[PDB]
Amino acid sequence: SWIYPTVILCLFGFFSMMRPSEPFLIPYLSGPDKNLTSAEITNEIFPVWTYSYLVLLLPVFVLTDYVRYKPVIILQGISFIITWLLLLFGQGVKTMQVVEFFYGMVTAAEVAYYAYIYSVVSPEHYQRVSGYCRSVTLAAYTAGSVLAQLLVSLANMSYFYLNVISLASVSVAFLFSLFLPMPKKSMFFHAKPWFQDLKECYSSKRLFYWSLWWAFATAGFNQVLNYVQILWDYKAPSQDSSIYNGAVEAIATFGGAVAAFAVGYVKVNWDLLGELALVVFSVVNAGSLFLMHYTANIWACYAGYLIFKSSYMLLITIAVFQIAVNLNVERYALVFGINTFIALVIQTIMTVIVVDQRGLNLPVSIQFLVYGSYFAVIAGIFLMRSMY
């Protein structure tokens, strides 16, 4: 039987990713609510997240398969509560780094949220039940942003009370996380009867190239998903004009989900398609970041974020569909854990070079040209593959 754990897990997802303060965070921490300058949020505060998503990845995943997936989801709920309490009632550059630390632990426990399904659902309904739950998170986000923007452009509700709605939502998410069914078996440690198995893990080359491209694409997308709000703030300030970040980010998540659904029905020969369409949409992403660095009208930057998130979600759903062909249940999660680790090492190196203060200390103007060049180098590796 699988109805009730699916219901409790989907309620946790739909009230966990229902954060209306998530689009309007950079007009919040740069407005009169918290006196933090843009250089501080760009260079001294946000990179901590990437740091706190590397160091907190490898233990938490091992805490994921050891205490059977429940106290790490309860830890995600407590992390939600502490993070949005510190966003509501924290002032100073000390506190916002602590916000980024607990939110890195949130994003680390997100994989533990997506890995809960394979412990209480029977192996008949692995594809169906998970096929609902992830969609619920997107359904929590898009409408979760619309309830943001339709409460800002129509009611003049404060950003503080937008964060208050976020805190109440993650509190409901934590109260649904307390009534979770404690499962019985894990996937690796408490599985019913791996150093020497590693050659058995990586006895391929197709997995290697799709995993390396997944790693670079995930690092680039996480960096752009960090700093696109600071780019939106720099192209048009929040105090000057009534910016529409919630509606654009909701439409962007919607277009990404529809693009992934379109990837799910591609009846094209893969050896005939993947040599061209991958390169074409990589050039589309590179041109999107080139557009967001070059322009001055903020509407061109909104269109750039729309096209970038949609084309990325297309390419990364192609990546997941290629990687998940021959893998088992354990192989899928193990290989994606190691690839997420490689992606966060690459993202941490690129953040230490570019974004962070003791480094190049580049502002948000130079950064998006650097990330357009990053996706262009990925497309150049694909072009050299097209020579091969």
Interface ranges with ligand PXM (CB under 6 A): 22, 25, 46, 49, 100, 103, 225-226, 229
Nearest-angstrom CA–CA distance, 179 and 116: 14
Taking the complex as a whole, the smallest distance from the CB of residue 8 to ligand PXM amounts, in Å, to 24
Q: Which is nearer to ligand PXM, 46 or 375 (CB)?
A: 46
Q: Is the Cβ–Cβ distance between 76 and 102 less than 8 Å?
A: no
Helix (H, G, I), strand (E, B) or coil at 297: coil
Taking the complex as a whole, the smallest distance from the CB of residue 16 to ligand PXM amounts, in Å, to 12
Q: Which is nearer to ligand PXM, 141 or 281 (CB)?
A: 141
Q: Is the Cβ–Cβ distance between 180 and 9 less than 8 Å?
A: yes
Q: Which is nearer to ligand PXM, 97 or 186 (CB)?
A: 97
DSSP 24: G
Taking the complex as a whole, the smallest distance from the CB of residue 37 to ligand PXM amounts, in Å, to 15
Taking the complex as a whole, the smallest distance from the CB of residue 359 to ligand PXM amounts, in Å, to 18
Nearest-angstrom CA–CA distance, 174 and 75: 9
Taking the complex as a whole, the smallest distance from the CB of residue 242 to ligand PXM amounts, in Å, to 21
Taking the complex as a whole, the smallest distance from the CB of residue 125 to ligand PXM amounts, in Å, to 31
Q: Which is nearer to ligand PXM, 130 or 229 (CB)?
A: 229
Q: Which is nearer to ligand PXM, 166 or 186 (CB)?
A: 166
Taking the complex as a whole, the smallest distance from the CB of residue 52 to ligand PXM amounts, in Å, to 10
Q: Is the Cβ–Cβ distance between 144 and 17 less than 8 Å?
A: yes
Q: Which is nearer to ligand PXM, 105 or 333 (CB)?
A: 105
Residue 205 burial (C-beta neighbours within 10 Å; 0-12, 13-18, 19+): exposed
Tokens read off for 136: 């619920």
Per-residue H/E/C for 25-89? HHHHHCCCCCCCCHHHHHHHHCHHHHHHHHCCCHHHHHHHCCCCCHHHHHHHHHHHHHHHHHHHC
- Kindly report each contact of residues 252-258 with a partner whose C-beta sits within 8 Å and lies 24 or more positions away, as own/partner: 252/305, 252/306, 252/309, 252/310, 253/138, 253/141, 253/142, 253/145, 253/309, 254/142, 255/306, 255/309, 255/310, 255/313, 256/309, 256/310, 256/312, 256/313, 256/314, 257/135, 257/138, 257/142, 257/313, 258/310
Q: Which is nearer to ligand PXM, 225 or 303 (CB)?
A: 225
Q: Which is nearer to ligand PXM, 17 or 260 (CB)?
A: 17
Q: Which is nearer to ligand PXM, 109 or 187 (CB)?
A: 109
DSSP 355: I
Q: Which is nearer to ligand PXM, 177 or 226 (CB)?
A: 226
Taking the complex as a whole, the smallest distance from the CB of residue 221 to ligand PXM amounts, in Å, to 11
Nearest-angstrom CA–CA distance, 15 and 141: 10
Nearest-angstrom CA–CA distance, 374 and 348: 14
Taking the complex as a whole, the smallest distance from the CB of residue 123 to ligand PXM amounts, in Å, to 33
Taking the complex as a whole, the smallest distance from the CB of residue 99 to ligand PXM amounts, in Å, to 6
Question: What contacts 120, CB < 8 A, 6 or more positions away?
Answer: 2, 5, 181, 183, 184
From residue 329, how far is each of 54, 135, 137, 326, 334 by CA, in Å? 24, 20, 22, 10, 9
